Amino acid sequence: AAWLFEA
Amino acid sequence: AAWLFEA
Amino acid sequence: AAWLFEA
Amino acid sequence: AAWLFEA
Amino acid sequence: MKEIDELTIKEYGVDSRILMERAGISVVLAMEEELGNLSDYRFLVLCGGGNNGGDGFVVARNLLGVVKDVLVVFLGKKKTPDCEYNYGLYKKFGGKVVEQFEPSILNEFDVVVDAIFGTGLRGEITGEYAEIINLVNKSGKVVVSVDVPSGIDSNTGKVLRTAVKADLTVTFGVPKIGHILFPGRDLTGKLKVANIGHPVHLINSINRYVITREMVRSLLPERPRDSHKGTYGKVLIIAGSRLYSGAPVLSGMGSLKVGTGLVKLAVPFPQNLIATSRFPELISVPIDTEKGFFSLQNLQECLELSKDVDVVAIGPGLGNNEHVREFVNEFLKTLEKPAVIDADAINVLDTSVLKERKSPAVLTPHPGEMARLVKKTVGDVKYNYELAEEFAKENDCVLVLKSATTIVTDGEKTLFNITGNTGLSKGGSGDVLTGMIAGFIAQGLSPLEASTVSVYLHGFAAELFEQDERGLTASELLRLIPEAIRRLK
Amino acid sequence: MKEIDELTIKEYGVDSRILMERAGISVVLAMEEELGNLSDYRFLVLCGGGNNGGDGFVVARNLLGVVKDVLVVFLGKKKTPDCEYNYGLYKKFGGKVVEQFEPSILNEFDVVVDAIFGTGLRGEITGEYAEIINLVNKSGKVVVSVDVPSGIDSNTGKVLRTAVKADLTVTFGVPKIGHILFPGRDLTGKLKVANIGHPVHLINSINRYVITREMVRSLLPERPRDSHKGTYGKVLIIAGSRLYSGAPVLSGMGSLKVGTGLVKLAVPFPQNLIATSRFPELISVPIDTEKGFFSLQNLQECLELSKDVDVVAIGPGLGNNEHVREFVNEFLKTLEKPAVIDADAINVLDTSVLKERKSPAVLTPHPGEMARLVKKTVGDVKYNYELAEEFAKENDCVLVLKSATTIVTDGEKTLFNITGNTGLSKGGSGDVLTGMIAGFIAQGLSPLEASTVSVYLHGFAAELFEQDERGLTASELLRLIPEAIRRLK
Amino acid sequence: MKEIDELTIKEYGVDSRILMERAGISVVLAMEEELGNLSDYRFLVLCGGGNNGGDGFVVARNLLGVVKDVLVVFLGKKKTPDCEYNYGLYKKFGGKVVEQFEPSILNEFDVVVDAIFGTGLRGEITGEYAEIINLVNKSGKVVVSVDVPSGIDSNTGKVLRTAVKADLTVTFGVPKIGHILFPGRDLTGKLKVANIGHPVHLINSINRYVITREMVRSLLPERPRDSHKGTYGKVLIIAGSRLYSGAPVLSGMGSLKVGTGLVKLAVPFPQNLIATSRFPELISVPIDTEKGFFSLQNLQECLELSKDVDVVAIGPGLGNNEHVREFVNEFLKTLEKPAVIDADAINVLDTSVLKERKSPAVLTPHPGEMARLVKKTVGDVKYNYELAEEFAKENDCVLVLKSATTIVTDGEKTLFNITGNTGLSKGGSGDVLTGMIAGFIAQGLSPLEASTVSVYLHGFAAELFEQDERGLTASELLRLIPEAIRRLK
Ligand SMILES: CC(=O)SCCNC(=O)CCNC(=O)[C@@H](O)C(C)(C)COP(=O)(O)OP(=O)(O)OC[C@@H]1O[C@@H](n2cnc3c(N)ncnc32)[C@@H](O)[C@H]1OP(=O)(O)O
Ligand SMILES: CC(=O)SCCNC(=O)CCNC(=O)[C@@H](O)C(C)(C)COP(=O)(O)OP(=O)(O)OC[C@@H]1O[C@@H](n2cnc3c(N)ncnc32)[C@@H](O)[C@H]1OP(=O)(O)O
Ligand SMILES: CC(=O)SCCNC(=O)CCNC(=O)[C@@H](O)C(C)(C)COP(=O)(O)OP(=O)(O)OC[C@@H]1O[C@@H](n2cnc3c(N)ncnc32)[C@@H](O)[C@H]1OP(=O)(O)O
Ligand SMILES: [K+]
Ligand SMILES: [K+]
Ligand SMILES: [K+]
Incomplete structure (x- = not known):
């Protein structure tokens, strides 16, 4: 879920 | 329901 | 919703 | 929905 | 206004x-x-x-x-x-x-x-x-x-x-x-x-009306519980030819699906056997013909068959040669029952015959057939409700001029039908409507009432088709008729 | 790339x-x-x-x-x-x-x-x-x-x-x-x-494309509300024989289910009666043959029948003897309407006839039929899109080379279809597709557009079958066509 | 970067x-x-x-x-x-x-x-x-x-x-x-x-981090099943005055709601009775004062009370006169336990005392209190993380500089907290946070870890309030703490 973006 | 408008 | 009547 | 991938 | x-x-x-x-x-x-x-x-x-x-x-x-x-x-x-x-x-x-x-x-x-x-x-x-x-x-x-x-x-x-x-x-x-x-x-x-x-x-x-759900509901006939098939009328359908074997089947079932008690078809042998193979509740009488089309040699048998029914529908799939023309016009001149006249029976019809009939008639032309019937162009007759009214009044009939908006008139009252969709723009649709009209007449509705109810329900049934309207066929339209009736109620 | x-x-x-x-x-x-x-x-x-x-x-x-x-x-x-x-x-x-x-x-x-x-x-x-x-x-x-x-x-x-x-x-x-x-x-x-x-x-x-849902949606023809059957085209299907009586029925309904206005079949008597017994909305014209197959004696009648239609499909269930070969090639040489050419009409086709035709054609071979048509092995033609392109360009036609991935080409544009499943690997599937193509042509789509839309929808319909695909038959595929159209929209 | x-x-x-x-x-x-x-x-x-x-x-x-x-x-x-x-x-x-x-x-x-x-x-x-x-x-x-x-x-x-x-x-x-x-x-x-x-x-x-849910989850202490209250630490809270009787109650419950085993308050009599009337699980020791505020006469008793606890919190509601100043500074100079120093204890604090303490300390000022503590303006200290780091390093403490974004630093590591809402901008909120920090220290977390976990959970609890945040009070915030812990897990 999080390779590209941290929320 | 229909004093003013017929559908 | 409110051209004719305020509640 | 489709900038990166076509299905 | x-x-x-x-x-x-x-x-x-x-x-x-x-x-x-x-x-x-x-x-x-x-x-x-x-x-x-x-x-x-x-x-x-x-x-x-x-x-x-x-x-x-x-x-x-x-x-x-x-x-x-x-x-x-x-x-x-x-x-x-x-x-x-x-x-x-x-x-x-x-x-x-x-x-x-x-x-x-x-x-x-x-x-x-x-x-x-x-x-x-x-x-x-x-x-x-x-x-x-x-x-x-x-x-x-x-x-x-x-x-x-x-x-x-x-x-x-x-x-x-x-x-x-x-x-x-x-x-x-x-x-x-x-x-x-x-x-x-x-x-x-x-x-x-x-x-x-x-x-x-x-x-x-x-004097001109849109046909509404409430009007049709008020005209649907009553179904008394202590009834028998004869209560709901008897229809003869004279239809078909060696060329057009399917038309009679669609018309007959059209009458049955609207609640008619007995439906008999007269169809040239062996094309009559096509009907009962699909719907064995139909009576499909074999008519002996010389070449696969009705002619004057079949006049007496059709008149005999007509005696024991309430209404006769004629036209769908008859073909349109000179021998069919002779038969159609002599049959309608002699027939003392209401007639619903469609398709090839309209194409060969002598309108003088309508004037002289004592019994009523409903004609169901599309604009091509109406054009031929009054010797005008399609563009001159299409949606021409004044012409339809004049024709109905002059010929003492009900005219049902089919199109996306259907016009129904007896010359005094004119009704417009707006139910339906483009799935009805396909062969076989009109054949169904013809049987619906005859069936409602046999059930006791006047020719105008029967036409009014039938055009509305036939269009409403089309709208009930589950999938894309372009895939609707007449056989599916038949199956949908009883649903349209239920929903109307 | x-x-x-x-x-x-x-x-x-x-x-x-x-x-x-x-x-x-x-x-x-x-x-x-x-x-x-x-x-x-x-x-x-x-x-x-x-x-x-x-x-x-x-x-x-x-x-x-x-x-x-x-x-x-x-x-x-x-x-x-x-x-x-x-x-x-x-x-x-x-x-x-x-x-x-x-x-x-x-x-x-x-x-x-x-x-x-x-x-x-x-x-x-x-x-x-x-x-x-x-x-x-x-x-x-x-x-x-x-x-x-x-x-x-x-x-x-x-x-x-x-x-x-x-x-x-x-x-x-x-x-x-x-x-x-x-x-x-x-x-x-x-x-x-x-x-x-x-x-x-x-x-x-x-220049080569995968056929997508969005492409097919953009090509589906419009259904104007003020329409009549003629708006949606007329198809003649020349098909069937004493050996293969079912093919014409599947092709005809294929045209009707995609929204065509009128479909007429010409089928040898009495095999023509099989069609209307199943689907009475079809017109199934009886053709008098000597031995149950089309021959040159039927040339003039088929040309007459063709005059009043927009497109002619030929081939499914014709049989493949010398008299069928003579008829097919002389008919296509004389016919001045678009033709969809399938099955036995491909097996007897003289490709010189295609070059000389002024009107368009779509051919729908499987690899066995394509092999025979260009005198090569199945393995040399299968998925050979360059060969298909060369054939289409040389013969001025659209070629639809059927397989699990179908290739559609006019020699300039080539499209690949990937809808469908193994339920289509069964007799009768191709007969349906032939009628779909003719129907879309009659509705106004170009031969390439009609082929593109038809291969996609025919495969998509198969995928909509509710139970195991191996149980799919052509009759069920017909019922699913209008659902595929609805879903596409 | x-x-x-x-x-x-x-x-x-x-x-x-x-x-x-x-x-x-x-x-x-x-x-x-x-x-x-x-x-x-x-x-x-x-x-x-x-x-x-x-x-x-x-x-x-x-x-x-x-x-x-x-x-x-x-x-x-x-x-x-x-x-x-x-x-x-x-x-x-x-x-x-x-x-x-x-x-x-x-x-x-x-x-x-x-x-x-x-x-x-x-x-x-x-x-x-x-x-x-x-x-x-x-x-x-x-x-x-x-x-x-x-x-x-x-x-x-x-x-x-x-x-x-x-x-x-x-x-x-x-x-x-x-x-x-x-x-x-x-x-x-x-x-x-x-x-x-x-x-x-x-x-x-x-070296500077945002405090995340995953970081806090990894720092929450373990609850061994074979435990007793002493396993989870003991806290003394020195708080309150005749003027500010509520502060001790909010701080004490703050420690209990985060899982601390025993909490004792030392509060001037009879204000100590307010605590147990609301939360009878607290121990609220009455301290005899001359005029309602702690003074040097209470030094020995508070040091005695401190012997049997793990951490001492001091400051909330103490008041800020000269006798409170003498007491606070002498107590912290002598106390050999971790101290959490808030509110009025910060307002009277001699920072020389922090340098000389062998035991650790956490200070929890808002910008007004930080301004007074380093003799600067509020605008010079607000969100001044470099100043906070310098202060923490020079005084060997953890500094928790409260604001909508809270800064937590020991001078080597700095963490930013972004949980919370404007419901926390209201009296009593800080008193709760003070008790949470002392409680986590008593449970075995280092002063920096305890501060990190507490600021995050205190803000997250506020966000869990069901109605409009402006109506949040400290008493409701207490009730929400165990829900925040559950959700964190
Ligand atoms: C009687 C009353 O006042 S009640 C009106 C309020 N109630 C309603 O509207 C209900 C009635 N419904 C109706 O149909 C009508 O009464 C109305 C009100 C909608 C139309 O009323 P009318 O004035 O008769 O017609 P409408 O507004 O369509 O058009 C008037 C004409 O349009 C113009 N016009 C008409 N045809 C053309 C044309 N081919 N090119 C350019 N202009 C044209 C004007 O020229 C004008 O006639 P003019 O040449 O004498 O100037
Ligand atoms: C131009 C760029 O750098 S952009 C690259 C990044 N972007 C992309 O990949 C998008 C492009 N997509 C593509 O198709 C190609 O650019 C690529 C990148 C996936 C393939 O690029 P290429 O280097 O042309 O081909 P690929 O990696 O498949 O193979 C190169 C060959 O594989 C080996 N090879 C090929 N066939 C065989 C064989 N039968 N047996 C053993 N080895 C073989 C190598 O020998 C090498 O050729 P060589 O004999 O000169 O050493
Ligand atoms: C190293 C690379 O190329 S990787 C870049 C791609 N990757 C990334 O962006 C990730 C990196 N993230 C970053 O923070 C930066 O690398 C960037 C790319 C977003 C910003 O890079 P920089 O060029 O250093 O800065 P930025 O684009 O903000 O601004 C440059 C300055 O803005 C202008 N500027 C700065 N302040 C002012 C001002 N007060 N008034 C008017 N203009 C100003 C320009 O003058 C320019 O400096 P200059 O005076 O020498 O012309
Ligand atoms: K207007
Ligand atoms: K690879
Ligand atoms: K920017």
């Missing part, structure tokens, strides 16, 4: 300004019903110099102070008294009017209110009116037409060079013929008919 | 390293989309010495520090410049590379990333490459292929001695022919096409 | 153009995640001459051909090498650039992409940059900022004369301090942090 306005003012004493105010406020209420809260929208109101533009001024004035923006473009050269009055009020209330239409003005509005021309349109629209209407149609804005989309002839539905395509049309008192016939029906979009205070007596004095 | 990469670099000025980075990160994002969070997985990345292996190094480097373990096995003998660059970055970022493939290494990984060969594969794979690929295919691990599964010829879909079977293939810019034709289509598994920054103009310059 | 870019390029060998491409495509993906399909939107991309504007050119180029319209307004006077490269690609791909900002241009776009200034902003924005930014903020369009909203100092969060208010900010590698502190936090809108290929080692080398 021109006369309805006049009588309401002149005989009943309702001030013209009251009628016009009620017209405009009806448009506002109708817009709210379709758009929800109006307060976020910007309105462009296009007003002509007639009473339609006067209605437009009432709309515009009633939106002042309640919506985001209102602008009136006044497109006429003079104003009727009521239009002048309401233009005056609009300006007194702070409203802005411009007298020049600028192409880019469309950019800053969300809704266009079309109050240019109503039922007073005469002749082709040209000049700057036409450019303006064309710009509105290319704009992609929401279009609300007052009374009738401008450019439609309210008496015929024809486009007078160009016309507004509306999302919503609000008309007053009664629908107009131009909302009901194409191309007008298509340009009208969603139609609302507003009560603006005409007395109900005048509104009910109209 | 080899030229698309080159032009994007050389003419547009995009650094090759940018394209390669975007390629690799697309693979990572695609894996996350299919696997969810990647952090728990251990990845084995198999890299060749070409630019595909370079993409692999980008994948591997981008997983460093984010997943459980990453290892690269480098399988080449030298590296392209971009592969060397990205190998260098992978090592600088702390990545581990080994140059020997150990069979037991598969044991400690969850996902294999196949970046051995892409579109640069030439010739049979052997030696240690082959052993490695075979070990990956026996491993039961999740396999992600970069660009094309290694071992597939990207221009044909053929396996070059052995090939990786992928769960997920991520390709760049456009699908490749090898993803679309079998066996490649099967080895590709789930395909994602990633935008890696080629300009859209170059991506749209491609 | 300026150094992170440099090292990634210069030491690791990643081409600067690769980093910039990955930055721009991250913005596109982030927009799609928030806006859905981008194809219907029109984009205005505002580009400066620096590398932020370069990122903007990448965004613009990647939207070419895929969205309704893209326009770049180039606002600089020269371009960095990478900005020039990407401007060049944008134009080669067919993109339009204008160099003059026209106020009405905003009218024809839906989304503004702000790529004017990033972390390279130095000094107040003026001139035409400022007019432009002000026009964007009045436009009502969707605003996406690249890296940091232009006009925010990325090191402090201060506005440099004016700044873009963004709906969405996409930043690269790590959040910046200016996204975390106000007013910058407010202007950032929704923040996404994109991985653009910096090695994870460099990304993890950062």
Whole structure:
């Protein structure tokens, strides 16, 4: 879920 | 329901 | 919703 | 929905 | 309705300004019903110099102070008294009017209110009116037409060079013929008919009607519990040929699916066997023919078969050669039962025969068949309800002129059917309708009542098809008939 | 696409390293989309010495520090410049590379990333490459292929001695022919096409297309509300024989279910009666034959019947003797209407006749029929899209070469259809498709458009069958056509 | 991060153009995640001459051909090498650039992409940059900022004369301090942090952290099943006065609600009785005072009470006269236990006492209290994390500087808390936090860990309040603490 973006 | 408008 | 009547 | 991938 | 306005003012004493105010406020209420809260929208109101533009001024004035923006473009050269009055009020209330239409003005509005021309349109629209209407149609804005989309002839539905395509049309008192016939029906979009205070007596004095669910419900015959098949009538269908073996099957089942008690087909052998292989509840009598078509040699047998039935349908799939012509005309001249006359029986029909018949008849032509029957072009007969009325009156029959809007008339009463879809534009659809009509006649409905109920239900059944309408076939339409009846109730 | 990469670099000025980075990160994002969070997985990345292996190094480097373990096995003998660059970055970022493939290494990984060969594969794979690929295919691990599964010829879909079977293939810019034709289509598994920054103009310059839902939706004809059956066209189907009585029925209903207005069949008596017994909305004209097959004695009647229709379909169930051959070729030479030519009409067709026709034609052979038509083996014609294009161009026709992936071509544009399933591998399926094509032509679509829409919808209908596909029959496929149309919209 | 870019390029060998491409495509993906399909939107991309504007050119180029319209307004006077490269690609791909900002241009776009200034902003924005930014903020369009909203100092969060208010900010590698502190936090809108290929080692080398759910979950202490109250620590709270009788109750329950085993309060009689009347699980020891405030006469009793506990909290509601000052400073000088020092104990604190203590301390000032403690203005200390770090290091303590974003630091590690809402801007909130910190220390967490966990949970509890946050009180906040803990797990 999080390779590209941290929320 | 229909004093003013017929559908 | 409110051209004719305020509640 | 489709900038990166076509299905 | 021109006369309805006049009588309401002149005989009943309702001030013209009251009628016009009620017209405009009806448009506002109708817009709210379709758009929800109006307060976020910007309105462009296009007003002509007639009473339609006067209605437009009432709309515009009633939106002042309640919506985001209102602008009136006044497109006429003079104003009727009521239009002048309401233009005056609009300006007194702070409203802005411009007298020049600028192409880019469309950019800053969300809704266009079309109050240019109503039922007073005469002749082709040209000049700057036409450019303006064309710009509105290319704009992609929401279009609300007052009374009738401008450019439609309210008496015929024809486009007078160009016309507004509306999302919503609000008309007053009664629908107009131009909302009901194409191309007008298509340009009208969603139609609302507003009560603006005409007395109900005048509104009910109209002789032409749209066929409604409530009218059809009231005409459906009763099913007494202590009944037997004979209670529900007997139909003979004379149909088919070596070329057209399917027609009789669709017509017969059409009668059964509407509740008829007994249906018999007379069909040339061995094409008669096709019917019972598909629907064994049909009686399909083999007729011995020389070459696969009915001829005078079959006259006596068909007359014999007719004695024990209530109604006879004739025509679907008969073929159209000289021997069929002789048979059809001699049979109808001698037959003392109601007849439903379709398809190839219309193509060979001698209309002198209809005049001389003592028994009633229903004819069900499409415009091609009607054209041939009165020796005119298709374009001259299509949606020509006055011609249909004249024909029905002169020939003492009910005429059912099929099209996307079907016209049903006995010459005194005319009814318009608007149920259905394009799935009915396919072979076999008419054959079903023929059987439905004969069946309702056999059940005790008058030829006009039976026609009225049948056109409505046949179109409503099509609309109940689950998948894309283009895939509808007559066999599926049959299966849907009892669902349409259930839903009607 | 080899030229698309080159032009994007050389003419547009995009650094090759940018394209390669975007390629690799697309693979990572695609894996996350299919696997969810990647952090728990251990990845084995198999890299060749070409630019595909370079993409692999980008994948591997981008997983460093984010997943459980990453290892690269480098399988080449030298590296392209971009592969060397990205190998260098992978090592600088702390990545581990080994140059020997150990069979037991598969044991400690969850996902294999196949970046051995892409579109640069030439010739049979052997030696240690082959052993490695075979070990990956026996491993039961999740396999992600970069660009094309290694071992597939990207221009044909053929396996070059052995090939990786992928769960997920991520390709760049456009699908490749090898993803679309079998066996490649099967080895590709789930395909994602990633935008890696080629300009859209170059991506749209491609002349071969996959048929998509959006393309078919845009081509479906409009159904004007004020229509009649003639609006939607008229089809004649010349079909059937004493041996093959069912074919005409499937073809006719194929035309009706796609929205055609009128369908007439010409079928030898009494086999013509089979049609109307099942579907009475069909017109099924009895043709008098000497022995149950069409012959020259029926030439004039079929030409007469053709005058009043828009398109003629011929072939299904005709039989293939010398008298059928004479009839078919003389009829097509004289017929001045579009023709859809299938089955036995293809088997007896003189291709000189196609060249001389002024009117258009669509031919719908399976590979057996195409083989016979150009006097080649089935293996030489199967999925041979260049041959299909040459044939279509030389004969001025549209060729629809049926198989699990169907090829549709007019010689200038070629489209690939991938809808359908194995339920269509059964007698009667092709007969339906023939009627669909004729029907869409009669509705106003060009022969190429009608073919494109029909192959897609025919396959999509099969997929809508509720139960196991192996139980699908042509009669059920007909019922599903209107659902496919609804869903398309 | 300026150094992170440099090292990634210069030491690791990643081409600067690769980093910039990955930055721009991250913005596109982030927009799609928030806006859905981008194809219907029109984009205005505002580009400066620096590398932020370069990122903007990448965004613009990647939207070419895929969205309704893209326009770049180039606002600089020269371009960095990478900005020039990407401007060049944008134009080669067919993109339009204008160099003059026209106020009405905003009218024809839906989304503004702000790529004017990033972390390279130095000094107040003026001139035409400022007019432009002000026009964007009045436009009502969707605003996406690249890296940091232009006009925010990325090191402090201060506005440099004016700044873009963004709906969405996409930043690269790590959040910046200016996204975390106000007013910058407010202007950032929704923040996404994109991985653009910096090695994870460099990304993890950062010494300042945002406190996350996962960090707090890993620090929560374990609850061994075979435990007793002593397992979970013992807290003494020295608090309250005749003036401020409620403070001790909120602090004590703060310790109990986070799982502390035993909590004792020392409170002047009879204000000590207020605590047990509300929460009878508290021990509330009556302290005999002369006038309702602690003084040196109570020194020995408080030291005695401290012997049997693990941590002492002091300050809430003590009052601030000279006798309280003497007591507080002598008590802390002698106390050989960790101390949590809040409120009035901070107001009278001699910071020389902190230097000489062998045991640890946590101080929890708001900016008013911090200002008084270091003899500076509120505006000089507010969000001054460098000052907080210097103070913590010099005084050997943990400093928790409370505000909407709370800063927690021991002088080597600094953590930023962003949980909470305005319901915490109300008396009693700080008293709860003081008890939470002491409780976690008593449970075995280090002063820094206990502070980190407590600020996060205290803010998260506030967010769990069911009704409008402005109605939140400290008593409700207590009830919500165990829910916050459950949700964290
Ligand atoms: C009687 C009353 O005042 S009640 C009005 C309020 N209530 C209602 O509208 C309910 C009535 N419904 C109706 O159909 C009509 O009364 C109305 C109000 C909608 C239309 O009323 P009318 O003024 O008869 O007609 P309308 O507004 O369509 O058009 C008037 C004509 O349009 C223009 N016009 C008509 N045809 C054309 C054309 N081909 N090209 C250019 N202009 C044309 C004007 O010229 C004007 O006639 P003119 O040549 O004498 O100036
Ligand atoms: C131009 C760029 O750098 S952009 C690259 C990044 N972007 C993309 O990949 C999108 C492009 N998509 C593509 O199809 C291709 O550019 C790639 C990158 C996937 C493949 O690029 P290429 O280097 O042309 O081909 P690929 O990696 O498949 O294979 C190269 C060949 O594989 C090997 N090879 C090919 N066939 C065989 C065989 N039968 N047996 C053993 N080895 C073989 C190598 O020998 C090498 O050729 P060589 O003999 O000169 O050493
Ligand atoms: C190293 C690379 O190329 S990688 C870039 C791609 N990747 C990323 O952006 C991730 C990096 N994140 C970053 O913070 C930065 O690299 C960037 C790219 C967003 C910003 O990079 P920089 O060029 O250092 O700064 P930025 O674009 O903010 O601004 C540059 C300055 O803005 C202008 N500027 C700065 N302050 C002001 C002011 N007060 N008034 C007017 N203009 C100003 C220009 O003058 C220019 O400096 P100059 O005076 O020498 O011309
Ligand atoms: K109008
Ligand atoms: K590969
Ligand atoms: K920015």
